[PDB]
């Protein structure tokens, strides 16, 4: 159809990739996947409530914590010019919320966030946020949005052998290494005779392996590698395809080049055919356990996810697999003990999987679930049982792991998978999940050519069922970004190099922002990091180019909804991959919930940050906040010392009331404790004063994580100015509190060691490609003191605090001289 052509044209603009393209393929996997996702799309579209999808009530079933609990809490309903307070019991349905003492709904003031459905007000994420900061709950009696706006446009036994013709490069010795991989485990490997490196190196070599055709497991990768000795080029091909048929025929595969990882596992070939290297291949093919052994595997199950299993361990786990099955924590270890290169062994594991019973009855463990979704597991059925457990997560918990789950797709062998279908279902059901799903997929499609083909199919399938409302919303969202991306790169051409922001560039920037406003930007656009907020017109006078080396843009927007007078601030940055920052901030958000289960709040500030395109994205501006280095630069001198007194001086100046100051010191103790614990675990503690900020209310927060993780020592920044606020020159009543929170927070994280280990490794494998080392990943274990006693590990973190005390401003001065030398 004629309208069908305009629809795919609209979709592509929003995706950032033409899905219809069949140039960089050698199979129909992606088209089969495009058609395959039509059924679960229409399934979830036809299942979802139309009225509830339009309003998306953000509700948690998690209990109200002891710190937030401290009956009858008041709210203020608005309509016309009316403004009246109402005493509400925590257990009260919005439909039951007493106003007549009926088809009008209670909307949040300034936001699209709704207080709707059959759930208590104490269970709403908005009400809980207002109790955390200590803010008033303001509501508006508005007409519910019409679900008509959310309408969807209709419509043998022999040994395996591979023939290698040769290699061709457009521009001293070289050879091909062919590996058969299943869960990063090499089943068999053969190499070619090293011939001299030239534009055309031919061999005509039949590489016959030991593995039989029947023995080949579904999801096995033929990893072809070009050496010299060091690796230069890599390419993969699935030995058994998406139709369970074995691969046959000629293949001219374009390889990826190494620089110096999940990217190393991709089933996609290089798109740049003009510059990349090609490789031509040819295919034509029940008494139960004694006490000591019982104690032996009980110790094996008890070990961490990074502790390696030996042949002795693997053999014991397989022999006593039916005993192992009773323990759900043994499942990743047990499926790592499987001889995947044997059809008979694989067949036994499938029978073992049928008797899931206890696994299906187990209380959901996310750390255990995601361990089965990493690079070690290439089995469709093994991974399926993990996705099975993810179904029981309510939408709030799905949001918590959405970014990590989206990155986990890189570990799936085939494009169409149970996880890819799950993310699709969960996104199409809840508007908030769908919004972030769009931006998480768009970020990968824009700066990852190894995975853009797969993710684009997933995103297209989401957009095809999300509804015209969210579509004509993502359109005005992408528009704004592309326009601002064009403005930042223009300033960057005038902008240095060295050394400071021009007087003329800020006026030339304001002119470009005044030029753009007249015709380009729609009246309003939804904030990507915060979907509830609708930002309208620019405050051109409040806009500037930041002093930072990458020249980011300090933008200020007026709020579009009249129900809200403070501006919306966005930092637009080019030159860096913000996917790195996003991941740290998401772990920081997870750590906050880990402390919520232990009834602790360490006032962390994981600000809004979304990578929107290629090496460009946007950051939330935390209002009334300033840099630690800026405070030390305010009172005195050039550099160094860094007078202990200066930190408290700013806090006493930026707080009028002593009740507001003793609240500002109170907030600082918890935030400093939280950021010391978090950065120590993640291994990003040693920062520069410039990358650490504080609000006028005393809340401390770290910024620009890409700078540190994208590159004598101190384990976390705890300087004498921070110690001065506590009242220590020694120990004070506020310092006793600091160490008390520091230990309680560190030990609480240690009760979720397995989760923090798998989130960390998956982060280093999908987010940052130069860390990617067995040596780099093992850090998390040492920081989390894996194996040590609770009182022993307590003394370990307290000794880290004492290092920071014995180091003074030494490192800070050394950092100040470094960013100057």
Residue choice 552, 606, 698, 715 for contact with ligand 1UK (CB under 6 A): 552
Find where tokens 């790592």 sit: 336
Q: Is 608 annotated as a binding residue?
A: yes
Q: What is the DSSP letter of 566?
A: P
CA angle 410, 609, 412 (to 5 degrees): 5
Q: Exposure of 248 by Cβ count < 10 A (0-12 exposed, 13-18 middle, 19+ buried)?
A: exposed
Residue 684 within binding range of ligand 1UK, rule CB under 6 A: no
Q: Is 701 annotated as a binding residue?
A: yes
Residue 619 within binding range of ligand 1UK, rule CB under 6 A: yes
Give the helix/strand (H/E) hosting 808. none
- DSSP per position, 112-144: --B--SSS-GGGBHHHHHHHHHT---EEEEEPP
3-class secondary-structure state, position 235:
strand
Q: How far apart are alpha carbons 120 and 817 in whole angstroms?
A: 56
Residue choice 548, 593, 770, 773 for contact with ligand 1UK (CB under 6 A): 548
Residue choice 121, 235, 703, 717 for contact with ligand 1UK (CB under 6 A): 703
Write down the least CB distance from residue 575 to ligand 1UK, Å: 9
Q: Which stretch binds ligand 1UK (CB under 6 A): 184-192, 222-230, 357-365, 546-554?
A: 546-554
Q: How far apart are alpha carbons 691 and 687 in whole angstroms?
A: 7
Q: Is 95 annotated as a binding residue?
A: no
Q: Which of 397, 791, 367, 792 is nearest to 589 (CA)?
A: 397
Residue 571 within binding range of ligand 1UK, rule CB under 6 A: yes
Write down the least CB distance from residue 615 to ligand 1UK, Å: 12
Write down the least CB distance from residue 546 to ligand 1UK, Å: 6
Residue 594 within binding range of ligand 1UK, rule CB under 6 A: no
Tell which positions 468-497 bind ligand 1UK, by CB under 6 A. Answer: none
Residue 621 within binding range of ligand 1UK, rule CB under 6 A: yes
Write down the least CB distance from residue 549 to ligand 1UK, Å: 9
* b/e burial code for range 763-783 (CB count within 10 A of at least 16 → b): bbbbbbeebbeeeebebbbeb
Tell which positions 624-653 bind ligand 1UK, by CB under 6 A. Answer: 625
Nearer to ligand 1UK, 370 or 616 (CB): 616
Q: Which of 587, 819, 579 is nearest to 690 (CA)?
A: 819
Q: Is 777 annotated as a binding residue?
A: no
Nearer to ligand 1UK, 624 or 802 (CB): 624
Q: Which stretch binds ligand 1UK (CB under 6 A): 20-28, 386-394, 484-492, 545-553?
A: 545-553
Q: Is 705 annotated as a binding residue?
A: yes
Q: Which stretch binds ligand 1UK (CB under 6 A): 343-351, 431-439, 522-530, 616-624?
A: 616-624
Which whole-number Å values give the CA distances from 747 to 301, 752, 759, 793, in the listed order? 21, 9, 18, 8
- DSSP per position, 388-412: HHHTTS-HHHHHHHHHHHHHGGGG-
Nearer to ligand 1UK, 225 or 495 (CB): 495
Q: Is 642 annotated as a binding residue?
A: no
Nearer to ligand 1UK, 405 or 553 (CB): 553
Nearer to ligand 1UK, 346 or 583 (CB): 583
Q: Which stretch binds ligand 1UK (CB under 6 A): 298-306, 425-433, 621-629, 760-768?
A: 621-629
Alpha-carbon dihedral 522, 526, 528, 532, rounded to 10 degrees: 180
Which two structure tokens, joined as six digits, stand for 779? Answer: 């850090």
Q: Is 702 annotated as a binding residue?
A: yes
CB count in 10 Å sphere of residue 591: 24
Q: Which residues pair with 422 in a beta bridge?
A: none
Which residues does 611 contact at the CB level (< 8 Å), separation at least 6?
Answer: 443, 446, 447, 577, 578, 579, 581, 582, 617
Q: Which of 185, 195, 169 is nearest to 223 (CA)?
A: 185
Nearer to ligand 1UK, 150 or 556 (CB): 556
Q: Give the per-residue contact string, 596-615, with ligand 1UK (x = CB under 6 A; - = no).
A: -----------x--------
Write down the least CB distance from residue 554 to ligand 1UK, Å: 8
Which two structure tokens, joined as six digits, stand for 588? Answer: 């920081």
Nearer to ligand 1UK, 246 or 506 (CB): 506
Q: Which stretch binds ligand 1UK (CB under 6 A): 50-58, 219-227, 544-552, 781-789?
A: 544-552
Which residues does 644 contact at the CB level (< 8 Å), separation at least 6?
Answer: 720, 721, 723, 724, 729
Write down the least CB distance from residue 569 to ligand 1UK, Å: 7
Write down the least CB distance from residue 572 to ligand 1UK, Å: 9
Q: How far apart are alpha carbons 395 and 415 in whole angstroms?
A: 24
Please count the residues of this chain forming the interface with ligand 1UK, following the rule CB under 6 A.
13
Annotated binding site: 569-578, 604-612, 701-709
Annotated binding site for ATP: 569-578, 604-612, 701-709
Applying CB under 6 A, the residues found at the interface with ligand 1UK are 546, 548, 552, 571, 573, 607, 619, 621-623, 625, 703-704
């Amino acid at each position: 159809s004629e309208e069908s052509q305009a629809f795919q044209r609209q979709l592509t603009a929003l995706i950032g990739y033409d899905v219809t393209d069949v140039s960089n393929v050698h199979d129909d996997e992606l088209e089969f996947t495009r058609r395959g996702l039509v059924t679960p799309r229409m399934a979830e579209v036809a299942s979802r409530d139309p009225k509830l999808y339009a309003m998306h009530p953000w509700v948690t079933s998690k209990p109200l914590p002891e710190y937030l609990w401290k009956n009858c809490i008041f709210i203020v309903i608005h309509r016309s010019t009316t403004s009246q307070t109402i005493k509400v019991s925590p257990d009260d349905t919005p439909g039951a919320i007493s106003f007549f003492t009926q088809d009008f709904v209670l909307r949040v003031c300034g936001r699209d966030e709704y207080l709707v459905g059959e759930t208590p007000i104490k269970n709403f994420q908005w009400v809980r946020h207002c109790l955390k900061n200590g803010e008033e709950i303001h509501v508006v009696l508005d007409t519910p949005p019409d679900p008509a706006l959310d309408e969807v446009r209709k419509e043998c036994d022999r040994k395996f052998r591979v023939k290698i013709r040769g290699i061709d490069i457009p521009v001293l010795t070289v050879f091909v290494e062919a590996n058969i991989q299943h869960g990063q485990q090499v089943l068999c490997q053969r190499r070619t005779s090293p011939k001299p490196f030239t534009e055309e190196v031919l061999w005509n070599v039949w590489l016959e392996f030991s593995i039989k055709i029947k023995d080949l497991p579904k999801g096995a990768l033929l990893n072809l590698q070009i050496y010299c000795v060091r690796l230069l080029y890599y390419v993969n091909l699935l030995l058994i395809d998406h139709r369970f048929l074995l691969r046959r025929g000629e293949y001219v595969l374009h390889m990826w080049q190494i620089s110096g990882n999940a990217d190393k596992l991709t089933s996609a070939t290089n798109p740049d055919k003009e510059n990349s290297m090609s490789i031509s291949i040819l295919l034509d093919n029940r008494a139960e356990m004694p006490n000591q052994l019982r104690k032996q595997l009980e110790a094996i199950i008890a070990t961490d996810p990074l502790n390696p299993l030996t042949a002795e361990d693997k053999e014991l786990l397989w022999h006593f697999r039916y005993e192992s099955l009773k323990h759900p924590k043994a499942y990743p270890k047990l499926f790592s003990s499987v001889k995947w290169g044997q059809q008979e062994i694989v067949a036994k594991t499938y029978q073992l999987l049928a008797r899931r019973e206890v696994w299906d009855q187990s209380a959901l463990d996310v750390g255990l679930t995601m361990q089965l979704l990493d690079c070690n597991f290439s089995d469709e059925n093994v991974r399926a049982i993990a996705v099975q457990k993810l179904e029981s997560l309510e939408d709030d918990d799905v949001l918590h792991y959405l970014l990590q789950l989206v990155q986990a797709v890189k570990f799936e062998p085939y494009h169409d998978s149970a996880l890819a279908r799950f993310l699709l279902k969960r996104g199409l059901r809840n508007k908030r999940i769908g919004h972030f799903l769009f931006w998480f997929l768009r970020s990968e499609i824009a700066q990852s050519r190894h995975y853009q083909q797969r993710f684009a199919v997933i995103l297209e399938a989401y957009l095809r069922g999300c509804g015209t409302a969210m579509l004509h919303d993502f359109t005005q969202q992408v528009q704004v970004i592309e326009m601002l991306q064009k403005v930042t790169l223009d300033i960057k051409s005038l902008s240095a190099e060295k050394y400071d922001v021009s007087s003329q560039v800020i006026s030339q920037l304001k002119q470009k922002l005044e030029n753009l406003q007249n015709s380009q930007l729609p009246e309003s656009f939804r904030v990507p990091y915060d979907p509830g907020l609708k930002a309208g017109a620019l405050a051109i006078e409040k806009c500037k180019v930041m002093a930072s080396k990458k020249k980011p843009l300090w933008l200020e927007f007026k709020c579009a909804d009249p129900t809200a007078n403070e501006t919306i601030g966005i930092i637009f940055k080019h030159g860096d991959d913000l996917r790195q920052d996003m991941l740290i901030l998401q772990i920081l958000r997870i750590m906050e919930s880990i402390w919520e289960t232990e009834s602790l709040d360490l006032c962390l500030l994981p600000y809004g940050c979304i990578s929107t395109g290629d090496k460009i994205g946007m950051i939330e501006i935390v209002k009334d906040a300033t840099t630690i280095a800026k405070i030390q630069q305010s009172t005195v001198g050039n550099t160094g010392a860094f007078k202990d007194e200066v930190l408290n001086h700013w806090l006493k100046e930026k707080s009028p009331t002593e009740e507001k100051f003793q609240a500002a010191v109170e907030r600082f103790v918890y935030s400093c404790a939280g950021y010391c614990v978090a950065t120590f675990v993640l291994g990003i503690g040693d920062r520069h004063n410039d990358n650490i900020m504080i609000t006028e209310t005393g809340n401390l927060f770290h910024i620009d994580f890409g700078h540190i993780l994208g590159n004598e020592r101190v384990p976390f920044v705890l300087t004498p100015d921070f110690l001065f606020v506590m009242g220590t020159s020694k120990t004070s009543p506020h310092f006793q509190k600091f160490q008390d929170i520091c230990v309680k927070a560190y030990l609480a994280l240690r009760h979720h060691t397995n989760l923090l280990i798998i989130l960390f490794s998956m982060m280093l494998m999908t987010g940052m490609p130069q860390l990617t080392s067995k040596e780099d990943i093992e850090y998390i274990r040492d920081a989390l003191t894996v194996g040590k006693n609770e009182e022993d590990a307590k003394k370990y973190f307290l000794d880290q605090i004492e290092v920071c005390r014995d180091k003074g401003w030494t490192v800070q001065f050394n950092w100040f001289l470094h960013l100057v030398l």
